[PDB]
Amino acid sequence: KTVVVTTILESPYVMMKKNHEMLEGNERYEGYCVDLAAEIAKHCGFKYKLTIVGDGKYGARDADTKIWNGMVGELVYGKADIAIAPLTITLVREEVIDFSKPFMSLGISIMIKKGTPIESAEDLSKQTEIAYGTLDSGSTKEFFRRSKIAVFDKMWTYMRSAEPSVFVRTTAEGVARVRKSKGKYAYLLESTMNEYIEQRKPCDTMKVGGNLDSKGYGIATPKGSSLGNAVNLAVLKLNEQGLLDKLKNKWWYEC
Amino acid sequence: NKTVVVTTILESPYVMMKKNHEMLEGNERYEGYCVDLAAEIAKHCGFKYKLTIVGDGKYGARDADTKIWNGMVGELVYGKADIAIAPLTITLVREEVIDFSKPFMSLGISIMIKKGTPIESAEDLSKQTEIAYGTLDSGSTKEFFRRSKIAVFDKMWTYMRSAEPSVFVRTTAEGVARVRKSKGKYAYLLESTMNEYIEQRKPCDTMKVGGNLDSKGYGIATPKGSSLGNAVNLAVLKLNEQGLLDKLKNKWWYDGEC
Ligand SMILES: N[C@@H](Cc1c(O)noc1-c1nnn(Cc2ccccc2)n1)C(=O)O
Ligand SMILES: N[C@@H](CCC(=O)O)C(=O)O
């Protein structure tokens, strides 16, 4: 009956509307993914329930318990029927779930507090005074972990052992750390967020250099899911009619 | 174990004739981005393959009259080719009849002009008629403008479909030659990938202006219900994550006559 949608609370994808306290159900939320979910549901003709992933994670497989967490986990163990959020299409995930073609293209990038003397990944790698890290249980950490590229390889050996920990549990925590570390902390995140934050007060962060790779976000469903193929056609249609660019301009519409 | 028939297309730097092709046989006649990818794909998946240039030299579209598919898409649809490894754009009409792996390259529609031409964006193009402009036939780009309800693009399509002489070209090479020979009176709408490649080729007289009109990607394609599909998709994502696809792009794109 009601499709259970798992998504994550990350502006401008999903955020609490003002005065949400007296609101109920899906009306409590607004954002890029909120509108996209509505679109998908409208064209596919089904009711749905937005639910914030319990642990607030994107999705990774515990190196020990070998159990998947985050939104990926919700789909794998059957808690959600579909994930509609900025979930990165990767090999280890495609091995356990299905993704539609990307509804957004992006790449890993570098966020620094304005004034920080670093222009690129090469810059970060050769020094240590300026610390840097990424999010836990995400596609960025994994990217560096599996990279054999000298540049990105060096960076990993540095992060994997840095103390105190350069890793963060949430993205909002990685941004907050840059803003508060007087230039001693650079953050590695996806271009999408780096751009969003650069146009926000106190307008003290910025993206430097080009992206380190080219990937995309896809709508995810349990492996061999029935809704899968239909959702993919729906998404390609929305993109081709220019609605997805419209949504992007709307939510990425200080500094 | 059977030799996999791979349909591809002659579009530099994806698939090009090697300098000594006249005295060479089969796959050794070609070189390029896609030739290298086909090799990488074939290696990991463990199978032998035969590169075959698509007979009509087209990408793929369904005929408005006969309703028959042509190009590489046609090769897959009618069972002539087992797989397509080329810069084939992932699109709705195609996904309806064939399968695509996830993108091995990202791009968007762009504007190529003869340097010095007074045009900076699609909006500029649509607001005048002194400078003609068109696109490639039987491809995703022409279909984009035909189905766009966006003011600018809609207006651009209204002009193009009725222009005289025709503003459409059969191959990308033809589009580039027209830009170069028309003294600035013709602008060509094509995918950023090809536009940036040409910008680095002699006589270095063309250039991309404005930003992409959309965002999409190229994907390896297989017939619907193909056992190769899923496996090749994972193989491509792997190559992508290891950076092999970016190194491959550098090689054939920037490793540059300008
Ligand atoms: N998407 C990654 C997570 C992930 C990761 O590993 N490193 O960085 C991110 C990331 N950064 N931003 N976003 C999403 C975003 C939020 C708000 C505005 C713009 C974009 N995700 C994953 O699926 O693991
Ligand atoms: N990539 C396009 C061809 C080039 C173009 O249409 O500009 C296709 O697959 O049809």
Curated annotation (Swiss-Prot), chain B:
The record's account of how the chain is modified after translation: Palmitoylated. Depalmitoylated upon L-glutamate stimulation. Ubiquitinated by RNF167, leading to its degradation.
Site (Crucial to convey clamshell closure to channel opening): 119
Tissue: Detected in forebrain. Detected in dendrites of neuronal cells. Expressed in the pyramidal cell layers of CA1 and CA3 and in the granule cell layer of the dentate gyrus.
Positions on the Extracellular side per record topology: 118-258
Regulation: induction: Down-regulated in the pyramidal cell layer of CA1 in the hippocampus by global ischemia.
Subcellular location field: Cell membrane; Postsynaptic cell membrane; Postsynaptic density membrane
Additional facts recorded: The postsynaptic actions of L-glutamate are mediated by a variety of receptors that are named according to their selective agonists. This receptor binds AMPA (quisqualate) > L-glutamate > kainate.
Function: Ionotropic glutamate receptor that functions as a ligand-gated cation channel, gated by L-glutamate and glutamatergic agonists such as alpha-amino-3-hydroxy-5-methyl-4-isoxazolepropionic acid (AMPA), quisqualic acid, and kainic acid. L-glutamate acts as an excitatory neurotransmitter at many synapses in the central nervous system and plays an important role in fast excitatory synaptic transmission.
Assembly behavior: Homotetramer or heterotetramer of pore-forming glutamate receptor subunits. Tetramers may be formed by the dimerization of dimers. May interact with MPP4. Forms a ternary complex with GRIP1 and CSPG4. Interacts with ATAD1 in an ATP-dependent manner. ATAD1-catalyzed ATP hydrolysis disrupts binding to ATAD1 and to GRIP1 and leads to AMPAR complex disassembly. Interacts with GRIP2. Interacts with GRIP1. Interacts with NSF via its C-terminus. Interacts with CACNG2, PICK1 and GRIP2. Interacts with GRIA1 and SYNDIG1. Part of a complex containing GRIA2, NSF and NAPA and/or NAPB.
Protein name: Glutamate receptor 2
Species this chain originates from: Rattus norvegicus (Rat)
Upper taxonomic lineage: Eukaryota, Metazoa, Chordata, Craniata, Vertebrata
Residues of the full protein shown: 413 to 794 of 883
